[PDB]
């Protein structure tokens, strides 16, 4: 801090770590566990049935109302069947006329793990 | 504190309720229209919505328009399936809270 | 068959089904794949080993 | 004793291999009346055991 008494912590990454202070004479210790955010997001729909050409627009609502610099690295398993883009909205535009695409979100600024949404073609 | 330490009451230990998810996949089920065979006899009385077949009879005067030879197979797509596994038990109850030796030299 | 009475022809080739027909299906789901559990950043937190 | 502690060969530890099962699912397929094609006309000659079309 400005007086050197306080210390502002910033857990940028993840994992357990210790933060020291008071370099003068005796130095104390204080553990700072960088536990994962695990802000579980939820897709608007999971069991969706897309059609040829038409792509039902989906969304990825996070557990909290908003996150600091929140963004989604949207991925689409079997990209030929369908693809998604954006962070909040998905836009699962289909290409193939049959298949199952496991469209799962991926929070770039947070935990990678996120809920998936299988887009059926029947 | 104590001479020997461990992670039992407050620490990052192991053991928990297993949870997992399976990516969406397409399952194909083929409903073959053949091998149904024939049951019952000539009507008589026949139930509604019965699939009509042919007896391979030589029509003396009429034309058997309901009998034909298949040329290509029929391919169908089945619906979705299971999602993932359910909760499972982790660890043994009688061995629960087992002591771990951690005394130092 | 819609249970239609034949006006002139005899529909003797169509009859109800009383015995089930065995059908063969393809393969299906087998098991789930690997999934991530817990956070590596906060997992395995170091514990103080200082004696009393 | 030893300064480092571990339970591998013989010790009262925790954690095991979880066992779980998936709920029963049934596969439903629709037998479409189209896409079966057609060859030739009224018999004539027809393949034995062929599906009626």
Residue numbers in the entry:
A (entry chain G): 253 to 374
B (entry chain B): 162 to 266
C (entry chain A): 215 to 266
D (entry chain C): 162 to 214
What does the paper say about this structure?
Escherichia coli phage SU10 belongs to the genus Kuravirus from the class Caudoviricetes of phages with short non-contractile tails. Here we show that the virion of SU10 has a prolate head, containing genome and ejection proteins, and a tail, which is formed of portal, adaptor, nozzle, and tail needle proteins and decorated with long and short fibers. In contrast to other short-tailed phages, the tails of Kuraviruses elongate upon cell attachment. After binding to the host, SU10 tail, nozzle proteins, and short fibers re-arrange to form a nozzle that extends the tail.
The genome release intermediate of SU10 b, d lacks the tail needle and contains a 277 Å-long nozzle formed by short tail fibers and nozzle proteins. The tail of the SU10 genome release intermediate is reorganized into the nozzle built from nozzle proteins and short tail fibers. To form the nozzle, the four nozzle domains undergo an extensive structural change from the L shape in the SU10 virion to the straight arrangement in the genome release intermediate. In the new conformation, the four domains form a line pointing away from the portal complex. While the interaction of the short tail fiber dock loop with a short tail fiber remains preserved, the connections of the short tail fiber loop to the beta-propeller domain rotate about each other and bend 135° to point away from the phage head. The same rotation is performed by the short tail fiber. In the new arrangement, the nozzle proteins and short tail fibers alternate to form a nozzle that prolongs the tail by 277 Å. Furthermore, the distal part of the beta-propeller domain of the nozzle protein shifts 3 Å away from the tail axis, resulting in a broadening of the tail channel. The structures of the SU10 virion and genome release intermediate differ in the direction in which the long tail fibers point away from the adaptor complexes. The long tail fibers in the genome release intermediate are rotated 6.6° relative to their orientation in the virion.
